[PDB]
Every structure is written in structure tokens, then in C-alpha cells.
């Protein structure tokens, strides 16, 4: 019964400046846990569908960096302990979205980036030719 009656909505102002056009957004997430990337993939893909963004997903090959350390504090060279860091990848490839839609979607999925997961988002912007290049001065 104790429900709000009216809710103040954040102010979104439509500008007079034209919006940016992104041909592609390549969201590459990196993590140590495949299951965490599976859950993030599900969240990010479901978020794109609700917002009407076209999204494709694939899994780039994982990278395992291994290195060797001495096991003993002193001598015993032939006895080593080997360690590794596993970096797993998921790539969300979004297409044909405006700059305003990219700001909302990236903010929404970047704020919800799980602990231990990094993101490299490569944005491909569409631009027209500069006016000086349209015709030769010579």
C-alpha cells in the first residue's frame, strides 16, 4: 500500500546537434572465470535485445600465461613450482547504433561489470569527408 504516487523522471534533453553514428561496437571482456563471462554474456545480450540493439557474440581463444619459480628458499634447483594466469574472452559485437544508444548501453553494462572482469570496447564511428577534401584546390 505504501507506494509512491508520482515519480520524478530523469531529464533527458533532445539537443539540436546531430548524433554520432557507430557502425560497430566491439565489446571484448576478459576474465579468469568462464562462468562469470557466461553470466555477463547473458546479461549483456538480454540488455541489448530489450533496447533493440543488434548483437552477435563469439568467444576468442583463451590465453594461458605460464611461468616457473623455484620451490625451495635455498638451492634444490631442479624442484620448481609453476603458476599460470588464464585469460578468457567474450566478444559482444553490436552494430548500427547511435551515439546516444551507445552511451546508455555501455554505461549500463560497464557499471555492472563483475569484479575481476575487464572490458575493451572498440568503437567504429562513421564520418563524412572533410569539406576541404571534397575538391582539389589545384
Amino acid at each position: 500500500v505504501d507506494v509512491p504516487k508520482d515519480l520524478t523522471k530523469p531529464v533527458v534533453t533532445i539537443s539540436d546537434e546531430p548524433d554520432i553514428l557507430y557502425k560497430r561496437l566491439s565489446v571484448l571482456v576478459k576474465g579468469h572465470d568462464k562462468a562469470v563471462l557466461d553470466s555477463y554474456e547473458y546479461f549483456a545480450v538480454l540488455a541489448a535485445k530489450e533496447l533493440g540493439i543488434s548483437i552477435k557474440v563469439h568467444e576468442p581463444p583463451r590465453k594461458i600465461e605460464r611461468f616457473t619459480l623455484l620451490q625451495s628458499v635455498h638451492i634444490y634447483k631442479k624442484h620448481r613450482v609453476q603458476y599460470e594466469m588464464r585469460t578468457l574472452y567474450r566478444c559482444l559485437e553490436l552494430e548500427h547504433l547511435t551515439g546516444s544508444t551507445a552511451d546508455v548501453y555501455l554505461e549500463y553494462i560497464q557499471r555492472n561489470l563483475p569484479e575481476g572482469v575487464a572490458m575493451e570496447v572498440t568503437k567504429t564511428q562513421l564520418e563524412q569527408l572533410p569539406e576541404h577534401i571534397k575538391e582539389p584546390i589545384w
Partner: protein
């Protein structure tokens, strides 16, 4: 059957033709004015209601990163152009 807003006024003052049309932008912040502005921030002072309001508060205070992430946030190289 009579509303309170209908009746006798005091009539000492008169209707403002318009609100002040040109503000004193460079008015100094006296201690009396700075302190009164703190009494107006205490009337809407309430504890955080949920985790979203804590992020909003940290974002306004500057503690929390602004999203989407910009690796150059807060770093303009003195407004220098590429040709410099």
C-alpha cells in the same frame, strides 16, 4: 463555505511588476548567505535509501567514476591542440 485564500489582504505591499530581472551574479558570499544555504541543505538531508542513491551521491561528490568510462576523464593537456 469560504476558502481561506479569499478575504482581506494586508495591502501594505504591492504586486511585484516582475521578479528581479537582472540578478547580482557577482554578489559576494557573506557568512550569513553561505550559512543560510546550509540550512536549506539540511531540510532535505535524509539517509541513503538504497544502493542506487549511494552511487548517485558518490558520483555527485566526484568519488565514483562517471560512466561510460573515459580514460581521459579529468585530463585535458592544457587545452593544447595537435599542431602544438
Amino acid at each position: 463555505r469560504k476558502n481561506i485564500f479569499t478575504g482581506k489582504r494586508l495591502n501594505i505591499f504591492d504586486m511585484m511588476a516582475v521578479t528581479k530581472e537582472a540578478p547580482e551574479t557577482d554578489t559576494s558570499p557573506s557568512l550569513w548567505d553561505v550559512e543560510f544555504a546550509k540550512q536549506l541543505a539540511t531540510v532535505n538531508e535524509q539517509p541513503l535509501q538504497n544502493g542506487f542513491e549511494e552511487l548517485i551521491q558518490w558520483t555527485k561528490e566526484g568519488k565514483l567514476w562517471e560512466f561510460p568510462i573515459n580514460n581521459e576523464a579529468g585530463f585535458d593537456d592544457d587545452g593544447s591542440e595537435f599542431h602544438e
